[PDB]
Scaffold this active site. Sequence first.
Site, PDB file in Angstrom:
ATOM      1  N   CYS A 183       0.560   0.274  -8.278  1.00  0.00           N
ATOM      2  CA  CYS A 183      -0.866   0.131  -7.992  1.00  0.00           C
ATOM      3  C   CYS A 183      -1.695   1.252  -8.600  1.00  0.00           C
ATOM      4  O   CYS A 183      -1.241   2.393  -8.662  1.00  0.00           O
ATOM      5  CB  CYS A 183      -1.126  -0.038  -6.504  1.00  0.00           C
ATOM      6  SG  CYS A 183      -0.134  -1.347  -5.744  1.00  0.00           S
ATOM      7  N   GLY A 239       4.431   0.889  -6.096  1.00  0.00           N
ATOM      8  CA  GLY A 239       4.054   2.154  -6.710  1.00  0.00           C
ATOM      9  C   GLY A 239       3.258   1.977  -7.995  1.00  0.00           C
ATOM     10  O   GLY A 239       2.603   2.926  -8.440  1.00  0.00           O
ATOM     11  N   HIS A 282      -6.313   0.918  -0.967  1.00  0.00           N
ATOM     12  CA  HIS A 282      -5.174   0.752  -0.052  1.00  0.00           C
ATOM     13  C   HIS A 282      -4.249   1.987  -0.015  1.00  0.00           C
ATOM     14  O   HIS A 282      -3.353   2.035   0.822  1.00  0.00           O
ATOM     15  CB  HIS A 282      -4.388  -0.562  -0.250  1.00  0.00           C
ATOM     16  CG  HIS A 282      -3.580  -0.667  -1.495  1.00  0.00           C
ATOM     17  ND1 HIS A 282      -3.825  -1.658  -2.441  1.00  0.00           N
ATOM     18  CD2 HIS A 282      -2.504   0.047  -1.891  1.00  0.00           C
ATOM     19  CE1 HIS A 282      -2.908  -1.490  -3.381  1.00  0.00           C
ATOM     20  NE2 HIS A 282      -2.095  -0.479  -3.095  1.00  0.00           N
TER      21      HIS A 282
HETATM   22  C1  OGF Z   1       3.646   2.908   3.313  1.00  0.00           C
HETATM   23  N1  OGF Z   1       2.561   2.130   2.740  1.00  0.00           N
HETATM   24  C2  OGF Z   1       2.751   1.285   1.713  1.00  0.00           C
HETATM   25  O1  OGF Z   1       3.851   1.133   1.185  1.00  0.00           O
HETATM   26  N2  OGF Z   1       1.613   0.627   1.321  1.00  0.00           N
HETATM   27  C3  OGF Z   1       1.512  -0.543   0.532  1.00  0.00           C
HETATM   28  C4  OGF Z   1       2.542  -1.478   0.476  1.00  0.00           C
HETATM   29  C5  OGF Z   1       2.344  -2.698  -0.145  1.00  0.00           C
HETATM   30  C6  OGF Z   1       1.111  -3.001  -0.724  1.00  0.00           C
HETATM   31  N3  OGF Z   1       0.863  -4.313  -1.234  1.00  0.00           N
HETATM   32  C7  OGF Z   1       0.342  -5.318  -0.315  1.00  0.00           C
HETATM   33  C8  OGF Z   1      -1.021  -4.954   0.209  1.00  0.00           C
HETATM   34  C9  OGF Z   1      -1.336  -4.499   1.523  1.00  0.00           C
HETATM   35  C10 OGF Z   1      -2.642  -4.087   1.663  1.00  0.00           C
HETATM   36  S1  OGF Z   1      -3.474  -4.283   0.166  1.00  0.00           S
HETATM   37  C11 OGF Z   1      -2.102  -4.897  -0.620  1.00  0.00           C
HETATM   38  C12 OGF Z   1       1.055  -4.669  -2.538  1.00  0.00           C
HETATM   39  O2  OGF Z   1       0.909  -5.820  -2.936  1.00  0.00           O
HETATM   40  C13 OGF Z   1       1.470  -3.552  -3.495  1.00  0.00           C
HETATM   41  N4  OGF Z   1       2.106  -4.080  -4.680  1.00  0.00           N
HETATM   42  N5  OGF Z   1       1.379  -4.310  -5.801  1.00  0.00           N
HETATM   43  N6  OGF Z   1       2.177  -4.730  -6.743  1.00  0.00           N
HETATM   44  C14 OGF Z   1       3.452  -4.791  -6.229  1.00  0.00           C
HETATM   45  C15 OGF Z   1       4.650  -5.222  -6.790  1.00  0.00           C
HETATM   46  C16 OGF Z   1       5.792  -5.222  -5.997  1.00  0.00           C
HETATM   47  C17 OGF Z   1       5.742  -4.802  -4.669  1.00  0.00           C
HETATM   48  C18 OGF Z   1       4.551  -4.364  -4.103  1.00  0.00           C
HETATM   49  C19 OGF Z   1       3.417  -4.374  -4.902  1.00  0.00           C
HETATM   50  C20 OGF Z   1       0.095  -2.048  -0.704  1.00  0.00           C
HETATM   51  C21 OGF Z   1       0.294  -0.830  -0.078  1.00  0.00           C
END
Ligand code: OGF
EC number: 3.4.19.12
Lengths: 304, 304
Positions: free
Chosen positions: B145, B143, B41
């Site tokens: 991830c 962040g 992602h």
């Molecule tokens: C600008 N792009 C950006 O911010 N890209 C982004 C934004 C969110 C995510 N997502 C959803 C998702 C979408 C597609 S696959 C997963 C997550 O779940 C990421 N995540 N993981 N642990 C977390 C804890 C607290 C908040 C967010 C958190 C992945 C990527």
Amino acid sequence: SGFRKMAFPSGKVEGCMVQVTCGTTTLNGLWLDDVVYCPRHVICTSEDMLNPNYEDLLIRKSNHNFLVQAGNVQLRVIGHSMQNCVLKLKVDTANPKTPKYKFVRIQPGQTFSVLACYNGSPSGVYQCAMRPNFTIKGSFLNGSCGSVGFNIDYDCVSFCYMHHMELPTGVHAGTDLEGNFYGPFVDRQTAQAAGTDTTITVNVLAWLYAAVINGDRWFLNRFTTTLNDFNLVAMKYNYEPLTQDHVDILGPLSAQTGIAVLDMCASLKELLQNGMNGRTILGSALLEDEFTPFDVVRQCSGVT
Amino acid sequence: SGFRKMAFPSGKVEGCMVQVTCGTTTLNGLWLDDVVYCPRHVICTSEDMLNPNYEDLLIRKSNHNFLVQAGNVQLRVIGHSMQNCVLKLKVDTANPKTPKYKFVRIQPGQTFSVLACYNGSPSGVYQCAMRPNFTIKGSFLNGSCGSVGFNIDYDCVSFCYMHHMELPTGVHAGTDLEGNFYGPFVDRQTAQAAGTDTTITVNVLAWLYAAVINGDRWFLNRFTTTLNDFNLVAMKYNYEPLTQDHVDILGPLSAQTGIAVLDMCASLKELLQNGMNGRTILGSALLEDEFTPFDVVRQCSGVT
Ligand SMILES: CNC(=O)Nc1ccc(N(Cc2ccsc2)C(=O)Cn2nnc3ccccc32)cc1
Ligand SMILES: CNC(=O)Nc1ccc(N(Cc2ccsc2)C(=O)Cn2nnc3ccccc32)cc1
């Protein structure tokens, strides 16, 4: 989201762990620059532990009697000295893995990570608090002595604790890195009173703010209290009296959540008087006091 | 004595953390040998996350679009490929800090340490269990991830988890190091059912044995039970059914304490039916299920 009892990454401290042997005893040492720090009780034998005369015991030891090994390489000892309850073994080689560091004396109620080691090898890492009575409730077996406690700010490790002893009550006691015990403890195999402990009020309030941030809000109520009224309840429940200094340190969490510190005190008061009624907060069924307000801000902001 | 939620020393894993940037997104990567592993992602933008076509998104990317940085040095990307939900970025330099390692797929109910990272920098380490429903209750912010889960046996790190997502319910989901999600999760910003979770019975019994070893014995009773009777109670309380395989894995703890597994089941049955009555076990007011029988033996024997 989510809130965990998080320890600092231990890598910088793993690089400092060595094994120290003197006579029949083996324990851990901390190798920083060209000095190895370890508990002075490494020089004791079975007949000594009841009331050791450390000065006399150390006089029978020479540099070559302290066997210091870093992994598979032997370090050469060129000096030894006792400072309070620690021995400082000067070696001919500076630790190439010495991180930026400080020796600090932590205050009761503050938290730190412990890297439990055996034979100079790390076994695990956990976070804990220095109790108000200056003991720690750790996980230490024989041979863990010399394992250290620390905090890390950016690239600097502040060493605050070196493990020395398990009291007959199963709680743990140790020193700062200058060999001064926290609390009234002495490095002797004798029954030693730890003294009345209390719950770290400011930390429970900090953890209540962490709960609100992470979505656990069932304990929030329509009440408020005063420092005076809250402290009468804290007295009844063996909680540390809350001061304005504690309120000030909770400022960042109160600003983030919009919940005034005294309103959070009113929630804590109701939880103390009524219990949890079979409910949980951040996966716990008791009031957690091992997270400082700084720990809550750090974990909730992702400081690296 | 003492029993703590201990994580593995994180040093070997800290040495593998890197930062990966693609377009507007920055997250963590795991650099082992000449390959950097990270969640796929990293190639998504705001309009993509609802239902990303990863194949199409990756086709628009070239090696030079993946910015990989290890501390202050930039790594040169000479290849990229997607395997399930992970990207494997081939780099021209093997990680000099690559420990001995394996990629493993852990079973539900097993535990592991997580090194939470932000911008390729470690922030903290904590121990957790893979829930029976294949989620983890971690502490992850945006962040985080690409932060990984692992176990260490001697000098070998078995990587078992890479963090990908927080479900709208605040629980966490991720993959093995081949990019296969644990559970039914997909890497999309959509509501996803996690499914009924249960308590890890074998782990609660293991932790009850740890309590006895460490002196907490108030819950021991004069009763016994059978696997059948205990499983009727486990059914009522949403506990995993106990099997002979679980009993066999508890063998070492039963032998050490002299308490037959079914007698410990009778204690667990009474605690499930009557609660703790305001008492605690190993500092907890609930039945802890994040210690496997192997974890209890390891911590109680001081394996390094
Ligand atoms: C600008 N792009 C950006 O911010 N890209 C982004 C934004 C969110 C995510 N997502 C959803 C998702 C979408 C597609 S696959 C997963 C997550 O779940 C990421 N995540 N993981 N642990 C977390 C804890 C607290 C908040 C967010 C958190 C992945 C990527
Ligand atoms: C053969 N000599 C030997 O075994 N020397 C030894 C033996 C015991 C100790 N003591 C007592 C003591 C005596 C003098 S100062 C402290 C400790 O308390 C050491 N300790 N620390 N955490 C522990 C956890 C579990 C069991 C023991 C633990 C120190 C040294």
